[PDB]
Design a protein around this ligand. Structure first.
Ligand SMILES: Nc1nc2c(ncn2[C@@H]2O[C@H](COP(=O)(O)OP(=O)(O)O)[C@@H](O)[C@H]2O)c(=O)[nH]1
Length: 433
């Protein structure tokens, strides 16, 4: 308590492995979150998917056609793992907006499920895409859905897209990271195992949902081919399973870990040794190498669970960039707000799977072009602007570990809300420790 054992000298692995080797040899993996409006087909689509996967029954599916996550101490996010012969996947979902944030934060990319039936670019669709890119998601698959109620009309498909695409781009996306797939969650056409109808093939000639997913995965798996031992290990603690030798579950956001190697957890700053890396939907199956992107469970020696919590951060013992703070600077981008932001204006900071009250402490400067700090004086921050800002945490019960977005692009992002409205996104630029 007064001090946990802590080191900055790497222990070696019981059975050293060639990371680059192990990556190549290994199957690609992708995690994704399934967003979309309330009546867009999210669950019938999910059902259909699992069904083609022989994970859902033929009747389990007829019931759904009139839970699904459940079927496949504090829980932060739900995961469901699955596999094809080409790739491994991990559906991510929160249980229970704050819940969307959790899902989005741990997912590699998003599938945006859209109702094509007879377009109104609506409230919670836009919300989700806004959170998606605020939170670090670059890749999308827009599952253009419910094609039957438009008889697979290329005319309509292309019409909805011409509305949505520009929005997605404005909001912060790039057109080549967006993939557009026509499907029917109900007929299962284009999802996985039921092929596109010939009528449909004469205009849509790109891949189906599943293949598109596998494609994503491969794209990812390649970047991870570089991974060295000169690469930091980063790991979001996502759940702590009770002991009666602790079990820690989370997502690697960087590098790799093998049994024998060591890690420090923040903010507790304990240095534990990992002696088993459990993985798979079970999580009895074990590997000798977890790498970035993998959802896994570490079986830790020298761990003190009372002082570990969801949303904590583990890293290489020689990695010294995670910090806790009252104050830090946000490169802040602002949406449409009711009132402007002023020094002292409080809000809730959302960050990874944690949320936290805070207030603006300083308005430091507008951002004119590129990244330059405009000499224009700034007494208040209004809607649809960007500025460097100093934030202060209030009523802190426990330190939040922070990483700047230069250190890591994903972990370094935060979403700001006040009075129930998503008001701004931010990149952590600097930490005033
Ligand atoms: N015509 C058609 N209807 C669908 C399709 N997929 C879902 N639906 C229906 O549209 C509504 C969307 O509800 P649901 O599946 O729960 O989507 P969610 O509530 O947004 O997750 C339900 O009545 C679905 O059964 C589809 O591919 N074609």
């Amino acid at each position: 308590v007064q001090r946990y054992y802590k080191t900055t000298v790497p222990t070696k692995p019981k059975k050293p492995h060639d990371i680059s080797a192990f990556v190549k040899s290994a199957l690609p993996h992708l995690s994704f979150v399934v967003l979309g409006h309330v009546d867009a087909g999210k669950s019938t689509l999910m059902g259909r998917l699992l069904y083609d996967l022989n994970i859902v029954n033929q009747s389990q599916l007829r019931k759904l056609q009139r839970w699904i996550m459940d079927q496949t101490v504090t829980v932060s996010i739900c995961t469901s793992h699955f596999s094809t012969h080409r790739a491994n996947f991990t559906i991510v979902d929160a249980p229970g907006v704050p819940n969307a944030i959790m899902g989005i934060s741990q997912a590699d990319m998003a599938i945006l499920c859209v109702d094509c039936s007879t377009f109104d670019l609506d409230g919670q669709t836009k919300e989700h895409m806004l959170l998606a890119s605020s939170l670090g998601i670059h890749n999308l698959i827009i599952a253009m859905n419910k094609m039957d109620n438009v008889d697979w009309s290329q005319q309509r498909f292309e019409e909805i897209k011409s509305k949505l695409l520009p929005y997605l781009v404005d909001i912060g996306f790039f057109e080549d990271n967006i993939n557009w797939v026509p499907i029917s969650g109900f007929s299962g056409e284009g999802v996985y195992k039921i092929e596109y109808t010939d009528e449909v093939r004469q205009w849509y000639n790109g891949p189906n949902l599943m293949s598109t997913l596998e494609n994503a995965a491969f794209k990812i798996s390649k970047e991870n081919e570089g991974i060295n031992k000169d690469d930091p290990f980063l790991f979001s603690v996502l759940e702590i399973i009770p002991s009666k030798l602790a079990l820690v579950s989370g997502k690697l956001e960087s590098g790799s870990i093998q049994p024998g190697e060591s890690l420090t957890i923040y903010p507790s700053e304990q240095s534990c040794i990992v002696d088993k890396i459990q993985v798979g939907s079970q999580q009895h199956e074990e590997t000798d190498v977890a790498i970035k992107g993998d959802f896994v469970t570490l079986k830790l020696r020298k761990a003190y669970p009372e002082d570990i919590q969801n949303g904590d951060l583990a890293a290489s013992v020689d990695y010294s960039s995670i910090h806790s703070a009252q104050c830090f600077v946000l490169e802040l981008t602002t949406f449409d707000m009711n009132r402007p932001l002023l020094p002292g204006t409080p809000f809730i900071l959302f960050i990874g799977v944690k949320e936290q009250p805070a207030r603006i402490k300083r308005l430091i400067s507008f951002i004119d072009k590129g990244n330059t700090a405009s000499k224009k004086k700034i007494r208040h921050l209004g809607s649809k602007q960007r500025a460097f800002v100093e934030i202060e945490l209030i009523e802190v019960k426990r330190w939040i570990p922070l990483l700047t977005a230069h250190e890591n692009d994903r972990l370094g992002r935060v979403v700001l809300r006040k009075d129930g409205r998503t008001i701004a996104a931010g990149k952590i630029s600097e930490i005033t420790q």
